[model samples]
Target: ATIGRISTGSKSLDKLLGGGIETQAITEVFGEFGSGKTQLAHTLAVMVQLPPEEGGLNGSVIWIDTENTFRPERIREIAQNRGLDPDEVLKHIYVARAFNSNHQMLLVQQAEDKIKELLNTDRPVKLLIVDSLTSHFRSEYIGRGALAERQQKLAKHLADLHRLANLYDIAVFVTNQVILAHSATLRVYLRKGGKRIARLIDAPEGEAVFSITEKGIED
Candidate 1:
């Protein structure tokens, strides 16, 4: 079967990615702060609810907010720009704030029940976002002294995400201040300059220049 994809809300980016972000896979976006990592995530939260013909998966979203970056107002604005009812769009998106790395891992595991619950519904979960996945681990496990333990924990955490993506056929979107690099199925590096840029770093060789406006990511 073909892979399902979700629009990033930018035509250039969707084309650069070959379709859109892949389902049953983990797509990692990394860059310096303000490179539009979280902004892209917010856009996807709105876009995923759209039907396939409109560049969406016809599904809902699960956002595991590790860095407290999931913004309801931003989501509302993006949804409104698409001529969608902001309140209706927000209803299908489920958000959880992870207090720490352990809590973050716990949330991903707990998401299984939620995903299952929605499976039979119209808006089954199709997108999972871990905005800035490394923040808690980076802060809590600092220095060479804690490297081994941190790596092991991170590995398990990512394994949990991978399992969910495959088992439930949901697209996993993870933002990183950095990566568990080898774990990502597709990796895109983001940057904001005179022009916003998204560079494909895995499974392809290309870059897309796009913009982030009040409406969200655009060509």
Candidate 2:
């Protein structure tokens, strides 16, 4: 954790990124239904709060949920499994839901004050995750007719996230609706076949496989 990467709560996935998710960049996870996207997001939410000695940042998280994916029960399960207090773990995560695309982008602006507030606290905020970052855009923008409009707005939103990541020196984790043509500091394409597989589409070392168990994502 001294290298400023937070663990994925699974060694296999962590190795897929060179280390773990880098602190000052956006790590995007792409997948279809039940393909282990939100599962990993939940894992990171819990892992980010773990102590540095345990490969965590010992900080808090701000999770913007666009798809009703933030699960306290899941966090409680991981927290209790990892010997951390469930209540305290839940408290450290700041959760918000975006009603629409513009609302989604507006929440990012509003978060500037929230990020500052957390930084002033003992639990310095270390991660901001927008699970399924492009869901709103994908739903609202229909065809090539709206492609330019959608992209322009998305570019601006991404820039806001980049600035926040650099300004706070924190990791921005986003789950994206991907088709392999997308870009990010790192992009892992996940698929659920006979086994759950994650391919580091933009990295040198390309692939890894793991399974979802009663506990969480595991090697």
Candidate 3:
């Protein structure tokens, strides 16, 4: 089975990724605050709505917001910049806010339900995004006393997400705010400064310097 790829809007970054993010697998993007992790997520939410010829899957998105970062306004802006109908793009994206780690995992179950619901529709669910996948886990389980328990729960959550990706051939995009323990198909690390940079950490040495403009991502 061939894996589907979704463009990140930066030609340089897409080239670094050998297409873009891979479907049916988990792609982990980790970075510090203000490193453009959420910005990338917002851009992808719009990118996944485009047709495959334009680097999308002709599908909708399942956004699991763990850090209250899901912004409809940003999605609209990205859509408009891409010359797409902002409202149409917003309508297809399903956003869910998770208050805690447990709720976050439960939302993954809900994502499966949503995928099933959209299976017969014109746009099926092609992307599953957990913005700042580890924020809740980090805050809720603090200190060494809860480290083991936190890791266990996180591992389980990651495994469940992988199952969904494999079963539905969906691309799982998660931002890690240990995350090194989970098995990700691809891993990209972002850095913030004068120029935002993304380094492919799992394969051949590759890097892309991009900027997050008001419209969205750019090379």
Candidate 4:
């Protein structure tokens, strides 16, 4: 059977991602601070709760919020504006705050078990989101001394999320932070060892973009 995939709910973005966020595969989105990474994630939290025809699962979303950026009120407003029930939309989302990187990875490792319990009780999770994957990683680890260890731990954590995605047939979306790299000239770079995390997932299938707008995530 074919696994379900994640769609960004933006036609242009979906097109860029080869139809949508691939099911059973980890899709990483990275951008700088206030670049709409969190906004996109919030949008997806609502979008994934939409029906299939509308580029959603009509299912629930599990949000691993490391930066405490999961705002249910904003989501409710967006949903209401879109003619969806604000309360119902918020109900389908599950949010967990990670105090640190190790805590975040521990949550990812236990996702399958927790999701299984939710499913058995009739709450089916269709999407998994990690907002700003580099936040905790950057905060906890510093300099060349912790570089290798941080990267290794990140890889393992990503692998666990990948496994959960495949095992449960859900779509996973991980967001990363970007940095400006000035070698010959200024160039964009995924920050705090985010490139390593990107390498673990399918590169071509993933997308690197910013979400900018007063209305909502643009792309």
Question: Which candidate's lDDT is highest?
Answer: 3
**lDDT rank, highest first?**
3, 1, 2, 4
- Evaluated at residue 142, the lDDT of candidate 3 is 86
Of the two candidates 1 and 3, the one with more favorable lDDT, higher being better, is 3
Which parts of model 3 are misplaced by more than 4 Å? 178-180
Model 2 worst lDDT run, 10 consecutive residues? 176-185
What does candidate 2's lDDT look like per residue over 80-168, in tens digits? 88888889999999999999999999999988888899886777888899987999998998787788788878888888998888888
Estimate, for each residue in 109-152, the C-alpha lDDT of model 3 and write its tens digit. 98999999998798989899998789999899888778888888
Off by over 4 Å in 4: 120-123, 179-215
Candidate 1 structure quality by residue, lDDT tens digits, 64-183: 998777889998999999989999999999999999998999999789999999998988999999987889999999987788788888888889998999888899999987434357
| Sliding window of 10 residues with minimal summed lDDT for model 4 | 179-188
Native-to-model Cα distance after best TM-score fit, residue 65 in candidate 4, in Å: 0.8
Answer with 1 or 2, whichever has the higher TM-score.
Answer: 1
> Clashing pairs in model 3?
none
lDDT, candidate 2, at 190:
92
**Cα displacement (Å) at residue 148, model 1:** 2.4
Deviating ranges (above 4 Å) for candidate 1:
178-181
Q: Per-prediction TM-score, please?
A: 0.95, 0.93, 0.95, 0.80
lDDT of candidate 4 over 107-186, digit per residue (tens): 88667666887774444787888886778988888887778777777777777887877788777878877622111101
